[PDB]
Amino acid sequence: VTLCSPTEDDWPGMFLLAAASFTDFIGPESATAWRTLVPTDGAVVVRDSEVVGMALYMDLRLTVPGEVVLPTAGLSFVAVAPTHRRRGLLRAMCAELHRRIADSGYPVAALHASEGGIYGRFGYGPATTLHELTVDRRFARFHADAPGGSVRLVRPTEHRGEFEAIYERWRQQVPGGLLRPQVLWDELLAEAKAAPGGDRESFALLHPDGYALYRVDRTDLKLARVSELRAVTADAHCALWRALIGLDSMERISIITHPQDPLPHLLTDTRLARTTWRQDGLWLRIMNVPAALEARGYAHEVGEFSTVLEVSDGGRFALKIGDGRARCTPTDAAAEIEMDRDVLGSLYLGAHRASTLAAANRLRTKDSQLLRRLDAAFASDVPVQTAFEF
Amino acid sequence: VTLCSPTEDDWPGMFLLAAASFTDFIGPESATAWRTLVPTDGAVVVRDSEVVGMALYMDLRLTVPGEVVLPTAGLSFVAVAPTHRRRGLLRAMCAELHRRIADSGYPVAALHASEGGIYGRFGYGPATTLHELTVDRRFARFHADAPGGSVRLVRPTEHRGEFEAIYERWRQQVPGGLLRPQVLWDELLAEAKAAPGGDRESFALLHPDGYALYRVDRTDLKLARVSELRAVTADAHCALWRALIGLDSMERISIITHPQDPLPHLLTDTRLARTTWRQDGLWLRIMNVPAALEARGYAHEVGEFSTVLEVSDGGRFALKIGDGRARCTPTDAAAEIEMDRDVLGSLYLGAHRASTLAAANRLRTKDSQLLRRLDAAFASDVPVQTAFEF
Amino acid sequence: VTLCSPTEDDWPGMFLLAAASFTDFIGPESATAWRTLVPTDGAVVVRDSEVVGMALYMDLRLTVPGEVVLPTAGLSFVAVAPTHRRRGLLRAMCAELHRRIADSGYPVAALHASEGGIYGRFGYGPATTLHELTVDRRFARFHADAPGGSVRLVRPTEHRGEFEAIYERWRQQVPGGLLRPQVLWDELLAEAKAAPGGDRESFALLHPDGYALYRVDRTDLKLARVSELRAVTADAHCALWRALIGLDSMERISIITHPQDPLPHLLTDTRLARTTWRQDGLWLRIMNVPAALEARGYAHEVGEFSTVLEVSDGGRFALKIGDGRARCTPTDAAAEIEMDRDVLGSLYLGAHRASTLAAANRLRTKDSQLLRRLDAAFASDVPVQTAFEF
Amino acid sequence: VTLCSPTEDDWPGMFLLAAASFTDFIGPESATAWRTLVPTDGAVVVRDSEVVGMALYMDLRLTVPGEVVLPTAGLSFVAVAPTHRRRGLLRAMCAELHRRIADSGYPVAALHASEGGIYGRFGYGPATTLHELTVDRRFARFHADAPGGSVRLVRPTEHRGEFEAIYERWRQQVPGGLLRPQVLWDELLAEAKAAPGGDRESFALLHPDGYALYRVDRTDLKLARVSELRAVTADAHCALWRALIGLDSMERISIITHPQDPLPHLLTDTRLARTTWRQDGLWLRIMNVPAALEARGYAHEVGEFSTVLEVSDGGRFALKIGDGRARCTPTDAAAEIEMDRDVLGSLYLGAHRASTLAAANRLRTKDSQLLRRLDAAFASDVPVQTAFEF
Ligand SMILES: CCN(CC)CCC[C@@H](C)Nc1ccnc2cc(Cl)ccc12
Ligand SMILES: CCN(CC)CCC[C@@H](C)Nc1ccnc2cc(Cl)ccc12
Ligand SMILES: CCN(CC)CCC[C@@H](C)Nc1ccnc2cc(Cl)ccc12
Ligand SMILES: CCN(CC)CCC[C@@H](C)Nc1ccnc2cc(Cl)ccc12
Numbered sequence A, B, C, D: 001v002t003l004c005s006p007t008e009d010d011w012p013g014m015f016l017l018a019a020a021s022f023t024d025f026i027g028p029e030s031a032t033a034w035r036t037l038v039p040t041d042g043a044v045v046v047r048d049s050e051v052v053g054m055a056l057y058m059d060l061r062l063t064v065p066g067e068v069v070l071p072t073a074g075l076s077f078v079a080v081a082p083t084h085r086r087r088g089l090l091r092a093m094c095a096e097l098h099r100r101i102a103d104s105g106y107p108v109a110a111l112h113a114s115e116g117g118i119y120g121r122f123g124y125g126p127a128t129t130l131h132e133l134t135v136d137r138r139f140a141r142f143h144a145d146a147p148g149g150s151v152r153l154v155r156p157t158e159h160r161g162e163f164e165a166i167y168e169r170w171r172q173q174v175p176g177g178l179l180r181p182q183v184l185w186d187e188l189l190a191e192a193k194a195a196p197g198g199d200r201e202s203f204a205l206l207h208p209d210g211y212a213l214y215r216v217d218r219t220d221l222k223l224a225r226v227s228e229l230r231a232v233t234a235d236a237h238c239a240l241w242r243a244l245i246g247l248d249s250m251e252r253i254s255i256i257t258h259p260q261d262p263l264p265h266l267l268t269d270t271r272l273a274r275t276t277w278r279q280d281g282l283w284l285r286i287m288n289v290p291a292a293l294e295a296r297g298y299a300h301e302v303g304e305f306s307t308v309l310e311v312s313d314g315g316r317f318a319l320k321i322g323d324g325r326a327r328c329t330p331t332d333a334a335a336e337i338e339m340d341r342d343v344l345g346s347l348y349l350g351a352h353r354a355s356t357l358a359a360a361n362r363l364r365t366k367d368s369q370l371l372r373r374l375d376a377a378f379a380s381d382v383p384v385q386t387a388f389e390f
Helices: A008-021 A028-035 A089-104 A160-173 A182-190 A234-245 A289-295 A341-348 A354-359 A368-378 B008-021 B028-035 B089-104 B160-173 B182-190 B234-245 B289-295 B341-348 B354-359 B368-378 C008-021 C028-035 C089-104 C156-173 C182-190 C234-245 C289-295 C341-348 C354-359 C368-378 D008-021 D028-035 D089-104 D160-173 D182-190 D234-245 D289-295 D341-348 D354-359 D368-378
Strands: A002-004 A043-047 A051-064 A068-080 A108-112 A129-136 A152-154 A203-207 A210-216 A223-231 A252-257 A273-280 A282-286 A305-311 A315-322 A325-330 A337-339 B002-004 B043-047 B051-064 B068-080 B108-112 B129-136 B152-154 B203-207 B210-216 B223-231 B252-257 B273-280 B282-286 B305-311 B315-322 B325-330 B337-339 C002-004 C043-047 C051-064 C068-080 C108-112 C129-136 C152-154 C203-207 C210-216 C223-231 C252-257 C273-280 C282-286 C305-311 C315-322 C325-330 C337-339 D002-004 D043-047 D051-064 D068-080 D108-112 D129-136 D152-154 D203-207 D210-216 D223-231 D252-257 D273-280 D282-286 D305-311 D315-322 D325-330 D337-339
Touching: A002 A089, A008 A028, A008 A043, A008 A051, A008 A068, A008 D152, A028 A068, A028 A182, A043 A089, A051 A089, A051 A108, A051 A160, A068 A089, A068 A289, A160 A182, A160 A203, A160 A210, A160 A223, A203 A234, A210 A234, A223 A234, A234 B354, A273 B273, A282 A341, A289 A305, A289 A315, A289 A325, A289 A341, A305 A368, A337 A341, A341 A354, A341 A368, A354 A368, A354 B234, B002 B089, B008 B028, B008 B043, B008 B051, B008 B068, B028 B068, B028 B182, B043 B089, B051 B089, B051 B108, B051 B160, B068 B089, B068 B289, B152 C008, B160 B182, B160 B203, B160 B210, B160 B223, B203 B234, B210 B234, B223 B234, B282 B341, B289 B305, B289 B315, B289 B325, B289 B341, B305 B368, B337 B341, B341 B354, B341 B368, B354 B368, C002 C089, C008 C028, C008 C043, C008 C051, C008 C068, C028 C068, C028 C182, C043 C089, C051 C089, C051 C108, C051 C156, C068 C089, C068 C289, C152 C156, C156 C182, C156 C203, C156 C210, C156 C223, C203 C234, C210 C234, C223 C234, C234 D354, C273 D273, C282 C341, C289 C305, C289 C315, C289 C325, C289 C341, C305 C368, C337 C341, C341 C354, C341 C368, C354 C368, C354 D234, D002 D089, D008 D028, D008 D043, D008 D051, D008 D068, D028 D068, D028 D182, D043 D089, D051 D089, D051 D108, D051 D160, D068 D089, D068 D289, D160 D182, D160 D203, D160 D210, D160 D223, D203 D234, D210 D234, D223 D234, D282 D341, D289 D305, D289 D315, D289 D325, D289 D341, D305 D368, D337 D341, D341 D354, D341 D368, D354 D368
Parallel strands: A068 A108, A223 A252, A305 A337, B068 B108, B223 B252, B305 B337, C068 C108, C223 C252, C305 C337, D068 D108, D223 D252, D305 D337
Antiparallel strands: A002 A043, A043 A051, A051 A068, A108 A282, A129 A252, A129 A273, A152 A203, A203 A210, A210 A223, A305 A315, A315 A325, B002 B043, B043 B051, B051 B068, B108 B282, B129 B252, B129 B273, B152 B203, B203 B210, B210 B223, B305 B315, B315 B325, C002 C043, C043 C051, C051 C068, C108 C282, C129 C252, C129 C273, C152 C203, C203 C210, C210 C223, C305 C315, C315 C325, D002 D043, D043 D051, D051 D068, D108 D282, D129 D252, D129 D273, D152 D203, D203 D210, D210 D223, D305 D315, D315 D325
């Protein structure tokens, strides 16, 4: 049992483990676009001879509060063979990639978790919240205050340029935003066409400042699933939902969105936009505590304050926050706040309140005023959204 | 079609309309406890002769941010006969009760809505959020950080005094908290016993600083439903959930809680606490804008600011917020913020952000800095919860 | 945390823990009949003051192969409070009752398990198999060979004497048979009547040599559930099933029976008797290995053989089996067969083959001929059935 | 309406009737491999001109107790047109094939039945039992006694040689085992690949002494279906199940196995391996009573005995069984045992006990000692399994 960077000769064994581990994984052609994002030395394999474990990271760009874009190591393609469970393979692979990621100078790593109980112990905290809304569009009426009482129905492949430009504006202005490389647009637009005994055709609704990609469900022919709605203005968001609610042959429109989606408030009956599912989205491991805390912007409303933050096995820092900026310097002064690394990841994009984590003892301080100040400072003006799964 | 305060001779016709309108309504004995809370002139009936419409309010005490307790008119028992729809009965009954409530000096009215599209147009905004969590307790393990790694299993009727004292502490410290009168404790403890072909027996878990009332579901014998968990400390909340997760004969524990319930963070897998349902809880109509805005406490973190707020048909006010206090005085100066009355009710307990309502055009300003300041100021340190339905 | 025999003052706390632990437990009146079977010193309670754990045994008579009746300690009413999990309460209660049971001279203990993963580690093996058959009686035709091509439809309470006499003959001739005391007949016949919003009335089919007790399902009005069919002859079994298949208003007849129920072979289509559920029934802990192995009869077909059997922490014995009898004497000679105590319980009534347990390594020998001889000898001529849950 | 051996010109009409009769039947390419197993004169067709009935047999090799391999006529492709029901076509086709099978010298015929009420009257008895186990693998823990606390994840098409060799060892040592010809391995490995809008890819787990072929369900993405597990040793069976329980992305693993599968005993909770389905597997018609009874081996444990067996319209025989061998000679001496031919088929591989068939009057004797001796003698040391459907 050795742990190495894979050679081109390892990739067939990796694709077998992938096919057997990931139901969404069609075959090698799938991985081609994503592999362009994996740097030299971005991958590890465990050999027993055959591949019994693998893991890699991709080079991503993640938007954080203050419209700051961080280089981000996106962990993916993580699998242990069913023959080799409880042998410490995941721990050994995560330790090696984290060493490489930290040495390469990434301030943060990120992943999407297949289960919620695995990645906490390696320092990852859930940092965005997926919120599925299902609208019974047969009853949906727009409120007198709703704007637009400008959208075209189009084939996605015919308007690639406009989708790319709208998404680029959205990903730079929204925390959780990720740069989407041309190879991932190629993939996305390939999935837009109908598959024999698979998905139905995707259509687009296109506004100058937003787009919605949607397709009728395979089996439930009265359900339209919105795969992605990117709106740069409130006017575009409202205009796009007026068009979706105009899908008169549908009973129901579902979307995976974020907890602060204003959709319900656009309707005379807010209860029509039902939360049908909630789950952790992006997970974040802070690799360098001071680089990460200094990089993000903070709420201007909270006045200047100083404290001492200890991350369990991640350092102790003098943290001063004022005028929307943090300074985070080494100290041996007594800790006023303590938390595990994963908790910091959960606070970092504003998706979870320090007060909530404190009430579960995840965050530890003896100062309730300091807790209120942390809550306010780490809050994000622009609500955190989830870009695309990787 | 006349609209009057009911005489004792009207109540049999009101109980018939009630039985036909409310599936939860067993008979006159139900209403007895609640009727002790209805003041003289708290009720209206429409006669065609028989009762075709009714509505009333109860005298309540509602906790708002800053631990301030407001006298509150609780609208309830609202029904129009199925013979008399689209005759303006609800509008006429709500106009009359609102006149009486305002003249009596109540700063706020509140209700629980049977549908989400009715009460907005009469000035009520959804002000609390019901959040059902279902835990698959067979997988639930507590996180190493969770406290208490002190609770007794008891019969509710044998510990009335301790439940009453715990709830009284909780309702004074939590926004959304409602005073519970002795007659409603009588009702609650009567519903605790098993019913022939109805609910199963309720049990209690009792801690010095919290209690949980729960009962196995009628038909799903592997589901325990927590009807009410009131915890005054984080230690009590955690200790009570350790005991609920100890119900080894159950697969699932469900509770109707609030969006900031720390339960998920107590577990090694946060995904185990699944959101299975979300809905508006308490609705709030601000009756007197200046009395209500001056009564509640505000976030100390936001520095002093002044603006001019117009409520559509509710006045225009110079609003100055600093040191956690508001002053709200008449002005004819130009409005910087405009919103309908219902929107103010939705902001008032901190359950909805001004920014979210602004993005749906419900709240209207041309100043993004003022929006951030309103969001921060109206936010509640202690998360808003829902007391009990009325 | 003390462990004691309960006084009459402990029983209210035991009934609270019972109500909270067992959904089938109506109240103290339930336990009255069963409590007549609990000997002095048959019960233990753990006090923290309130009852946080309890367990007891009843005096039973269990039929084993060879029509031999053993005094049997029936463990029941076992519960640990949800407040007191992972404190070793079950282990401490089982250790104390086992000490008392062994000292009192019981050769075997027995229980029905609420979960399949608990009792193995205390030496209990599953010893009978519950097998639910559902017949689509609309297609059921009897085979030309089936007997009876003599039964009365009766009210159970009017023929108590005849049911008692038939059951007494059946329980003495069938391994798994249990003596049913008059107080359990009182209970059974009380459950025969309809309950408001509960079970429907039970009817009986009565033959001189068998009876079937059945009732239409609460909600599925086309399903008849046979709660108990006791047939002393093949003619009675066939005659009773002809009558059940005559329930022309039903679609389906279900029964919880044993794997060798001949019902399917009575039909022209054996597939009509569908196995819809299977589960462990009675569990058996052999308390005294030599007393138990010498008491039961063995297959006459297998010729005399001798071996040395070791039970893990239960002794090593020279075991000689011939002419349907075993002699089982102390030895320090080398073990030819080894197994944990629970495995012996699983073999004891003939429900599980030594060969099957050997293939999972539960039973360990290096002699395949000895395995075939054990399989044959422990096999039961009369198939093992399950009497009634306790 | 004539009954003939088909010419090559009949096969298009046979493929039409096949397509209309068998949902599993894709087209002529399906039948190609199976047709290599049909001897000259192995097929009959009824013509009205078009094909309204067909039936054929394949040359098979079936393993019976004692590791004896019998030439076996496998009936298959049996269909009557929906236009021609109740015209005696099936009876006429079965009479003709049985004449040919008996004259060709086959001692037994076998089939898989589409319904359970058809083939009894033509002398076929159900001889193996299909037993579906579904494991909730999220709770599955191996017992301390389980072996292996050696398997590779592989693509089936890349290890054909090893699967062929393992299966050949398994089919010779297991009653119910069938020789699998190269053309059926070609078919099997063709079905291993994914189909557009059909089955997902199959994977293999490969041990030196066993293999498991499995694939994720089409629609239930948390269910893995084991299509075939062939283990020549207990160590291989346990090692393969450790790997299947390592499919961490699955909730449930299902397999169609046999009633004596030791899997449940490998787990700390035997109840986790739930029986979700049971059905007759292989059916057997004894064509030559003396050839069949003399060919199979018998239990060595039962001492020498002699009896006289009558098969209804199948002869009367002096049957002497001792030292694991039978001698079966013509007699006119009085019958001590009588049964229809189908009953003998059901006894022949040890899947059904003589005592069980006797209790339904299918087997008739006045000697209970003779019944015990038949039960013991016909029992199979190695439990009967089902090879592959034909
Ligand atoms: C956990 C399930 N998986 C892994 C295949 C899908 C995750 C989401 C999708 C868009 N990501 C992917 C889909 C397909 N191939 C890929 C190859 C690499 Cl290297 C990385 C990510 C990939
Ligand atoms: C909309 C459905 N309803 C009205 C009966 C139940 C609402 C919640 C319950 C606890 N409230 C009530 C239940 C029963 N009776 C009552 C009598 C009056 Cl005056 C007021 C409230 C009541
Ligand atoms: C595990 C679920 N339980 C325990 C109450 C029911 C088991 C089957 C039933 C017939 N047994 C019982 C039912 C009711 N009360 C009883 C009191 C005693 Cl001491 C013992 C057994 C009892
Ligand atoms: C009753 C349903 N059927 C008959 C097609 C499928 C039975 C099982 C499968 C593996 N057997 C078969 C599948 C496909 N074609 C075949 C052609 C012949 Cl001659 C015999 C058997 C065949």
